[PDB]
Amino acid sequence: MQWSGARALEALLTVAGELRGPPLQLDTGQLLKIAKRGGVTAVEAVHAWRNALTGAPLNLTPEQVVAIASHDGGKQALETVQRLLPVLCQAHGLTPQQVVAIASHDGGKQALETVQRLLPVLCQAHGLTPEQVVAIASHDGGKQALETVQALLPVLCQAHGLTPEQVVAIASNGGGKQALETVQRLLPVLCQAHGLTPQQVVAIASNGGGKQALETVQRLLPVLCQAHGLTPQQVVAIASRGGKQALETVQRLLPVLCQAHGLTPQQVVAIASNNGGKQALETVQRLLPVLCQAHGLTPQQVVAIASHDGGKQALETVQRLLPVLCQAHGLTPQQVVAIASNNGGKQALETVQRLLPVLCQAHGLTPEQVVAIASNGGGKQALETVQRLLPVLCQAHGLTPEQVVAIASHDGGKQALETVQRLLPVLCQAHGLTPQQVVAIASNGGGRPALESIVAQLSRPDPALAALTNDHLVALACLGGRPALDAVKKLEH
DNA sequence: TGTCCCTTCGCGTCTCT
DNA sequence: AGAGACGCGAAGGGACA
């Protein structure tokens, strides 16, 4: 809409169609995405030098270009990337993905320029890996983090005996500069006076809005312990996972949730020690009545649902969809809670709703199964992936459905499934594995990296060679995936 | 109306034992 | 194996030009 001058919105839609055109092929959603967080000059600039970016020394993918553009100061980044990508890759040995990853943030120009300028001095003089330097820089106001890290790292490590690991941890977030400065200032105070281990202080600062969480603790720490009878351990739990808002909100709503709604302080901390703790608490304060109602649920279960990232979303979604699932799709509430009691509950429930019938009719599954898939983190993703990949896995690669469901019924189901599709061939023919084995490996959390690891060891029998036969390596990877396999290589080093 | 920086929230995946 | 660490990104707000 955005009126100022006119006649020249023609020049704006001139470009919109041309980007659906060939070097890039942008769909609607992508142009949305650009224009929305990038603005119009972003869109203009993409067009401007679409060819320059797709070939030439840069050879970026469309989705990479979008990623960079879709941020405040996208134009600036795109310009800046053209300039600096090759020099950063050549003169400091970064990958493109790394350069892009630095750029794909607000004030990308600044990060890139600041990386160029300071990558060496940090890597050389302060002995940092470039991995780490990229980590610090790959955020909003990286320039500031980078700059601050230079300034304070000697001070933090000598005067307050902090590992560089820890400094990186703190700086590798939004508002690093703030977190760092705040830690310097408040470390003595918090450790000596309020009796915290520096590990705890870093724990707190090593999230976004750490500055805020730190300040808020120094203030509210005694209060919460003396008055509301909380342990400092509990307070740091909250301060590390939900930070400022959660702390404040806890003080504000603790008495209420115990007097009126009868929860144990134990449980209140559970709920608040997460992202959007503030949000969850306020949500359970409402709703908890109307949830222990419609027959509905016990407090145990409402707590369960709220005690995750985006608890609010879960509770709101549960409240809304509990009827339609229970009556129209025949699920006990026990199951609905199971689904809701993970990260992205909302997302699972909604996905279940719309895919239950499909999987059960079209793909021949019991509801019990679908719930199992859905009763994990990233339920949505597993469900959706099962839908795509069940046929192809059963026919092209020759698995039973019960096997596919097993693979899917774990955190990261999506990945497991996708990874099986990629590797099951090479594994079974080229290295002589037997599908039932491959499935067993994949039917755990970390199924993907399990597989990826197991392969890498066979394709190039790594430093610790011979020694373990394949049936062993399988046994091991079923027992602890990549962690185990790595733990064996590190038993030879 | 663009650019930069900071804080809060939500989703997904893996590992720690 | 459920808790907790970790990575990622959307969204919203403030400051300045």
| Domain spans, chain A | 1-493
Alpha helices by DSSP H, listed for A128-231, are: 130-137, 142-158, 164-171, 176-188, 198-205, 210-226
Return the half-sphere exposure (C-beta side, CA atoms, 13 A cut-off) of residue A349: 29
CA–CA gap between residue A108 and residue A105 (Å, rounded): 5
| Contact by Cβ (8 Å): A404, A365 | no
The separation, in Å, between residue A7 CA and nucleotide C4 C1' comes to 56
d(CA A300, CA A297): 8
Q: What is the DSSP letter of A383?
A: H
Q: Is A483 exposed, middle or buried (0-12, 13-18, 19+ CB in 10 A)?
A: middle
Helices (H), A242-366: 243-259, 265-272, 277-285, 288-291, 299-306, 311-326, 333-340, 345-362
Pull the structure tokens for residue A6: 């006119």
Burial group, residue A95, by CB count within 10 angstroms (0-12, 13-18, 19+): exposed
**CA separation for the pair A174, A142 (Å, rounded):** 8
Which residues lie closer than 8 Å to A429 by C-beta, 6 or more apart?
none
- Please enumerate in sequence order all residues whose Cβ is within 8 A of that of A211, keeping only pairs 6 or more positions apart, or say none: A175, A178, A179, A181, A182, A205
Query: Which nucleotide, over all strands, has the C1' atom closest to the CA of A135?
Result: C7
Residue A324 neighbours by CB distance under 10 Å: 12
- Angle at alpha carbon of residue A224, lines to A205 and A297, rounded to 5°: 95
User: Is A277 within 8 Å of A312 (Cβ atoms)?
Assistant: no
- Residue of least CA–C1' distance to B9: A276
- CA torsion A200-A202-A204-A207 (nearest 10°) is -150
Identify the residue whose Cα has the smallest distance to the C1' of B13.
A412
Which candidate, A210, A124, A121, A119, places its Cα nearest to that of A167?
A210
**B1 closest protein residue (CA to C1'):** A39
Buried b (16+ CB within 10 A) or exposed e, A138-160: bbbbbbbbbbbbeebbeebeeeb
CB A359 within 8 A of CB A370: yes
Q: Which amino acid is at A424?
A: L
Structure tokens at A449: 């990296």
Instruction: Output the furthest CA–CA distance in chain A (Å, rounded).
Output: 75
And the tokens for A424? Answer: 């099951």
Decide: helix, strand or coil at residue A259: helix
Resolution of this structure in Å: 3.0
**Reduced to 3 states, what is the DSSP secondary structure of residue A115?**
helix
* Alpha-carbon gap, residue A19 to A38, rounded angstroms: 15
CA A356/CA A386 separation, integer angstroms: 12
CA A339 from chain center: how many Å?
20
Q: Which two three-digit tokens encode residue A322?
A: 């509990």
- Return the structure tokens found at A259: 């007097």
Return the residue matching tokens 């053209």: A82
Answer positive or negative: Cα dihedral of A245, A251, A257, A262: positive
Between helix A210-226 and helix A176-188 the angle, nearest 10°, is 40
* CB < 7 A contacts with chain C (nucleic strand): A 33, 36-37, 67, 70, 72, 101, 104, 106, 138, 140, 169, 172, 174, 203, 206, 208, 237, 240-241, 273, 309, 343, 377, 411, 444-445
The one-letter code for the residue type at A308 is: H
> Which of A373, A375, A437, A377 is closest to A401 using CA atoms?
A373
**CA distances in angstroms from A191 to A153, A246, A249, listed in the order given:** 19, 22, 24
Six-digit token string for A195 = 């009796």
Expressed in angstroms, the distance from the first to the final Cα of chain A is 63
CB A393 within 8 A of CB A421: yes
What tokens were used for A397?
């690669």
Residue A232 Cβ under 7 A from any strand B atom: no
Residues A62/A25, Cβ–Cβ less than 8 Å: yes
Any strand B atom closer than 7 Å to A277 CB: yes
d(CA A301, CA A299): 5
Phi, psi for A231 (deg, rounded to 5): -85, 150
Nucleotide nearest to A213 (CA to C1'): B7
* Protein chain A, residues 130-159, with a C-beta closer than 7 Å to any atom of nucleic acid strand B: 140-145
How far in angstroms lies nucleotide C14's C1' from the CA of residue A443? 48
What is the rounded CA–CA span in Å between residue A85 and residue A93? 10
The full length of chain A comes to 493
From CA A85, how far away is CA A197, in angstroms rounded? 42
Nucleotide nearest to A384 (CA to C1'): B12
Handedness of CA A267, A186, A165, A105 (dihedral sign): positive
| Phi, psi torsion values for A143, nearest 5 degrees | -40, -45
Q: Is the CB of A373 under 7 A from strand B?
A: no
Amino acid identity of residue A395, one-letter, is Q
**Among A381, A370, A421, A432, residue whose Cα is nearest residue A399:** A421
The Cα A301–Cα A298 span in angstroms is 5
Q: What is the distance in angstroms measured between the alpha-carbon CA of A71 and the sugar C1' of B4? A: 11
As a whole number of Å, the CA-based R_g of chain A is: 26
Q: What is the distance in angstroms measured between the alpha-carbon CA of A284 and the sugar C1' of C6?
A: 27
Torsion sign (Cα): A392, A397, A401, A402: negative
Quickly count: other Cβ atoms within 10 Å of residue A392's Cβ: 11
Amino acid at residue number A310: G
What is the rounded distance in angstroms from the CA atom of residue A377 to the CA atom of residue A339? 9
Give the residue from A68, A70, A62 showing the smallest Cα distance to A82.
A68
State the DSSP code for A341.
Answer: S
CA A355/CA A339 separation, integer angstroms:
14
Distance CA A370, CA A374 (A): 6
Rounded to whole angstroms, the Cα distance separating A289 from A298 reads 10
What type of residue sits at position A370? V
Nearest C-alpha neighbor of A203 from the set A189, A213, A192: A213
- What is the C-alpha separation between A373 and A381, in angstroms, rounded? 10
Nearest to A280 by CA among A230, A241, A314, A236: A314
Residues A297/A337, Cβ–Cβ less than 8 Å: yes
Q: Is the CB of A113 under 7 A from strand B?
A: no
Residues A278, A157: Cα–Cα separation, whole Å = 34
Q: Cα angle vertex A88, ends A82, A91, to 5°?
A: 130
Cα A237 to chain centroid, rounded: 20
Bases on strand C under 7 Å from any protein CB? 1-14
Whether nucleic acid strand B comes within 7 Å of the CB of A265, the answer is: no
SS3 A251: helix
Neighbours of A206 (CB within 10 A): 19
Residue whose pair of structure tokens reads 């320039």 in the numeric block: A143
Q: How many Å apart are CA A140 and CA A108, to the nearest integer?
A: 8
Residue A48, SS3 per DSSP = helix
